[PDB]
């Protein structure tokens, strides 16, 4: 039955990325912004290799990102959709049923502005999934998800439109 309780779409995780191009104080302030927003200590990502054009070097701490799950993820997601005034594009949804958008100023989310911190843009990505994804993540007896239970673009788009009364463009 397609109308089963356990087939319910719901958010798996929300990942917040700030890819400040340098290392040091600015990256530290981006990490402070992320720790403020999520309430969890974020983790800093190092450059996989050196590019002179981008001004980065291998193992230089470039970006910072954090993963939030549960009610806090829902609150942050709707806080970010308010900034987007609840209007994403069709191109924002991946073939695997995940979607993302990018804000440009972190004070638009609704947190206090500090001159020392400044403003950072931010990247939002939401990982969608039904119940039973633990099959693919547990240690013992890991398996794959059946085709009907898989998350795809159309189901995620319809679920987002229904649950948020928003519009999914396609320009």
């Amino acid at each position: 039955k397609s109308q089963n309780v356990m087939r319910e779409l719901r958010i798996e995780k929300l990942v917040l990325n700030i890819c400040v191009g340098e290392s040091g104080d600015r990256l530290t302030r981006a990490a402070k912004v992320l720790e403020q927003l999520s309430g969890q200590t974020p983790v800093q990502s190092k450059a996989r290799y050196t590019v002179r054009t981008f001004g980065i070097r291998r193992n230089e701490k470039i970006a910072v990102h954090v993963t939030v799950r549960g009610p806090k993820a829902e609150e942050i997601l709707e806080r970010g959709l308010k900034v987007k005034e609840y209007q994403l594009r069709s191109k924002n949804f991946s073939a695997t049923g995940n979607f993302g958008f990018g804000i440009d100023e972190h004070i638009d989310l609704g947190i206090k502005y500090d001159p020392s911190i400044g403003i950072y843009g931010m990247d939002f990505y939401v990982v969608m999934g039904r119940a039973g994804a633990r099959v693919t993540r547990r240690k013992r007896a890991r398996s794959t998800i059946g085709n009907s239970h898989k998350t795809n673009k159309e189901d995620t788009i319809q679920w987002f439109k229904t649950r948020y009364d928003a519009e999914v463009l396609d320009k």
């Binding site: 983790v43 800093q44 990502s45 996989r48 290799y49």
Partner: peptide
């Protein structure tokens, strides 16, 4: 604090293939 760990093995990379200009 905490930082991402190197899941990859490209120790002596320092650049990447496919990354070709004019492409």
């Amino acid at each position: 604090k905490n930082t991402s760990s190197k899941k990859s093995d490209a120790a002596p990379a320092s650049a990447d293939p496919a990354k070709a200009k004019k492409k």
